[PDB]
Symmetry: D2
Subunit: 337 residues, 4 copies
Amino acid sequence: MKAAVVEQFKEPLKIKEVEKPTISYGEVLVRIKACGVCHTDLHAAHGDWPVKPKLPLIPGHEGVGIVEEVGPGVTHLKVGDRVGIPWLYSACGHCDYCLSGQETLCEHQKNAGYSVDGGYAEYCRAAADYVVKIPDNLSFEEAAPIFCAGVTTYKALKVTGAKPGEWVAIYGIGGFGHVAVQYAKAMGLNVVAVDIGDEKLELAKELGADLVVNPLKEDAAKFMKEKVGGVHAAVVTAVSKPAFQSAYNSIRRGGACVLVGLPPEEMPIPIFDTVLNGIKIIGSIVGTRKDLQEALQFAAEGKVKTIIEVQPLEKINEVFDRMLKGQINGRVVLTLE
Amino acid sequence: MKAAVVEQFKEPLKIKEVEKPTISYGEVLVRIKACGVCHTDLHAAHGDWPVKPKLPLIPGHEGVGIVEEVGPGVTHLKVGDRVGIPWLYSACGHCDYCLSGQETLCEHQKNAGYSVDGGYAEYCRAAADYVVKIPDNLSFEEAAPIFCAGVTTYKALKVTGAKPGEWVAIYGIGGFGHVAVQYAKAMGLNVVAVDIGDEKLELAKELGADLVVNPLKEDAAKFMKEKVGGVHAAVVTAVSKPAFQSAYNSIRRGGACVLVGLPPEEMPIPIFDTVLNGIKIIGSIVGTRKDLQEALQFAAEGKVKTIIEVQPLEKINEVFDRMLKGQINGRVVLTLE
Amino acid sequence: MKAAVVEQFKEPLKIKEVEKPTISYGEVLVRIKACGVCHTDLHAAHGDWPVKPKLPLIPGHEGVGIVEEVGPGVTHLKVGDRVGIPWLYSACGHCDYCLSGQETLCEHQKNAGYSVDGGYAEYCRAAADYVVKIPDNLSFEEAAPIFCAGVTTYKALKVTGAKPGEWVAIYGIGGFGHVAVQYAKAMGLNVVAVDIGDEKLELAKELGADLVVNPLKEDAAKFMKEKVGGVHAAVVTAVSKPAFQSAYNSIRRGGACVLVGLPPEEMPIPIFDTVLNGIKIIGSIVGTRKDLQEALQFAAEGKVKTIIEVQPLEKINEVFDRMLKGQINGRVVLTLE
Amino acid sequence: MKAAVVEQFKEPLKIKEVEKPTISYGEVLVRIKACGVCHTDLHAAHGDWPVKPKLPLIPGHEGVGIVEEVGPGVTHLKVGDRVGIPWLYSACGHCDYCLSGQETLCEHQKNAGYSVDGGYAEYCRAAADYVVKIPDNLSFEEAAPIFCAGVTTYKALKVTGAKPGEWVAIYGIGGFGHVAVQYAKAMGLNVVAVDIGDEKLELAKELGADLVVNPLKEDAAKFMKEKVGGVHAAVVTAVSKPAFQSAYNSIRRGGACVLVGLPPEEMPIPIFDTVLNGIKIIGSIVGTRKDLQEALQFAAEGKVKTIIEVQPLEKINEVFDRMLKGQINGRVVLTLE
Ligand SMILES: [Zn+2]
Ligand SMILES: [Zn+2]
Ligand SMILES: [Zn+2]
Ligand SMILES: [Zn+2]
Ligand SMILES: [Zn+2]
Ligand SMILES: [Zn+2]
Ligand SMILES: [Zn+2]
Ligand SMILES: [Zn+2]
């Protein structure tokens, strides 16, 4: 089978033939139809995160395809089921986190396409209990990104705890923001899109966003004041010092600021105002199998559609390239068939 | 009527005769029997907060006493009712915050002994709807610190989400700290007291604290760890960057780190861990009229007692010196009879 | 001023001149532009409920209109503010219910057009803290059913716990039913409309409802099995024994069955299944001042429109006649100008 | 090995030597040290519940003992661990219920000592992922009842949603009731014990209960009114027509009635009053693995202790004799060593 191996950090990826994995108990082998690409893959190749991966490594925590074989004793999935292998490759199922509904946080979790081989290959071995069925009415192309940025974003929106009728501010109408907006709408919310790019605010608006501001150009929080009483919550999709300061100020008292990005730097946050106004700052990323079942169904119903550009496995290095100069419109799925 | 009065900032106050206030509609006239003192009264005195008070000012948002006359309109209180006047002097009662359970954040709120004359005097004019009744079984001197330290700490504990069985770390065993521990135990929780004085830790243990550490010499997070598996939550009662930092690291994944102090500067949270481990950082101060009633009732049942020292009004300045010098263990309550 | 007046029970009401009421401290005087009618106004008329009203009485708790004078004390309202007088005429605003978010349950509540004169007259005296403002963008005739049907149904939907994506069954597509469906949709929900008239089911479908059943020629519970896997919840808007048993059986395990009707008799629940499957049976009526504000805002944004028929005061008895005969489709709103 | 086999319904159980079971993948073999008996077991003998068991059957869903062998692939349990096999023998792990945290409700669940052999034998095959470790500081004797009576009751208490400070009424200080009281105390609550026998009301008070009342002698609901203000919730441990009516009436408006009984009959509830007071009626039984770990730990800390009478396997039929007569005080554990 063919794959895209990261042999050495920061080095271009090899598109070589590799040994096609074997499967023992409780596993499935999956023939990969597509696999979405996001910044996380790139950081895996560059090797520049506290915990770094084991080389060589096939990336892809957004791989989706067909269950080709089912190892001894797996019963809840049949050959030929349409299926996806999300970031949470496996978790213990036994610790407290797992028994709460926070398997996403399990200390002994293995991560797809980072600590084990993932979706940048023709085939992928997966943990049967931990793969998720893609519903019929939803294409492989479309589903792939629902596995990262869909759930990440959807779950974030559940986490804001904003309820139908209330207002969320989405910060950054890129690959997260652009799908956030649709989820927030499908979730009963009124949206404020916030972005430096006048064309992204245009997109967000076709996408359902109720109000746009461009935080240049004028004052974003003073506009959300202003206007809508200040938003109930904000989702930050490109967390940076000024992105956060904005979200923070625009949120009404008691509001939540949910941070979904993964930047290297430490913040800071005002303590006085946070205490005086009981502001909530919360990290969230990916989400539960159930979160994903739920996020996938919204897409399955037309309520959210991702802006994809298809590419083949071999153009991967060009796509990281591109990604690193920040020239990617939403998300890049890789075709394998 | 005599009062402690703030004439100029950073200047000794003047115990002196002033005008005994007149009452209008929905107001009551309270004869102060005792008033609590905390750092907040002092920051008023020094006038060093972003929104400074207007001089002259009688401080005290921890005053309790007897209702001497009802204003017209008020029908829910009678002459002789033992009552208190919280930091939350008044709220509009109509804004959205007021119709959630969030009067504490009302944009129109007035603050006792800050934006209006408070409890450092023989009498106080108060908004009837906003006074909280003291249970019969609890004395004036005991009740008074429950009006700030009690509610603030109790509320903080509720906001943590922590359920009977779970673990909290209380950071700093001072005025808030030592009452925080008692509320924690009364609420089903298991407690790790954390402080730099081994004396405070000894006091914590007396108050029910399950486990102590001091933090210089190890290392709280890792003790805590090691050990209870990391606490479900932390309440930080004196926020220095090192306290908040340890608080942050001791908290297990999914955990809530409730901030309760009001220091001037900003403190930096590491975005990457905050997102990855689903951390919550939350500000909280004081509480609802109902929060307070609940806070008060635990004390009535003898499940939390404050460490009070009683000084007469005339000694207020002497007490601010010992405050600046950091010498007050527990809480000082002013007497007025 | 003129009014429809209940002089003796079960007798036709007399349209006649009466005293235009005078206002004291904290009240306002509203000039009624329109007032909704519901079964509850008729149960007052017939005096057949456990706690009967004192005669003579002006019914109507869906009265909306212009504020014509502000009582002394009231500061949050001005003359010409378009306002409504909900069933919750007033509460003590001090008890525990009132300081949760449960004013709806206050032991001292007074009810509009039941314990005190209400909306069936040119003027009405109301408790200022308790009138709810009507959005600018919404007319009197539309607003008025939102003051009973809207909140009761919207709240009811919230109380079910059902989150965006999940399924509810709205049982009975009448005055409540047809507004329930619209709220349900605006709230992110998927809706199974259930009624005996195939006509109502067509109406439901126009209103946004995803699936209908009759039951009553199919099995409804089994339809819902089947289908959607059983609904997360049911709001039962006309509680007859059969509707309840059907509702109860259609709900999936863990489910909530929210009751909203007020029939005289008792309905039996199967203790053994209720425990085994963790079912919840919950009563809900009307809602908070804040509940209504939210209910009202959905209508302002055009997401729920009530089907109204307008009649002048003089035609009231003709409308109670059509009410008993069960002929009123949707809601009737009385005009007074 | 020897077991207590239900060969024919209602017929006395045969203590007979039977085939020691074998274990495959994902399973464990357990040597039973003890096994609690309760009403459920008896209803498996008598065969008188909607879904009846397959015969022969070895009852016991409170069996606790030692992991004698681990089947291929299990990794969390190790040979020699102390362990228990609760009512929920197994569930699918993949349906919605399972992924909410409602495995208790899974349509595909097997039940121990009912739909498969459980604890009334010397040995018991079990689903590795579904057994729970008994904490070290807790005897097999003490733990056995925590596996059914403990959780059912602990969980019930979480479900009431009552919080530290509030009041719950435990109805029936028998087998469940007597441990409920301790749990509610441990959970921060204030308890009202309600029982016909002064016997039990004395026991309850030793066990921590704040107030008692015999529904003889006098009005239970009016006493609770009265007094405490009406309880926030009631757990009903012996559901009967008049028990339930009492709990119902004593609950304050907004309160919850958690039913924990398994009586054969239907049971009227008032609809009018339920709606008007937003009352909640909720079935609950057993609970999650995590619910059970938590319930076990309270006992481990000496916060709840079960009143046990030990008996060997042979007197099992003597125990059902007394039980059907209702002369058992607390719970009967069977010894197997
Ligand atoms: Zn990704
Ligand atoms: Zn785990
Ligand atoms: Zn204070
Ligand atoms: Zn306000
Ligand atoms: Zn009505
Ligand atoms: Zn009240
Ligand atoms: Zn049992
Ligand atoms: Zn299941």
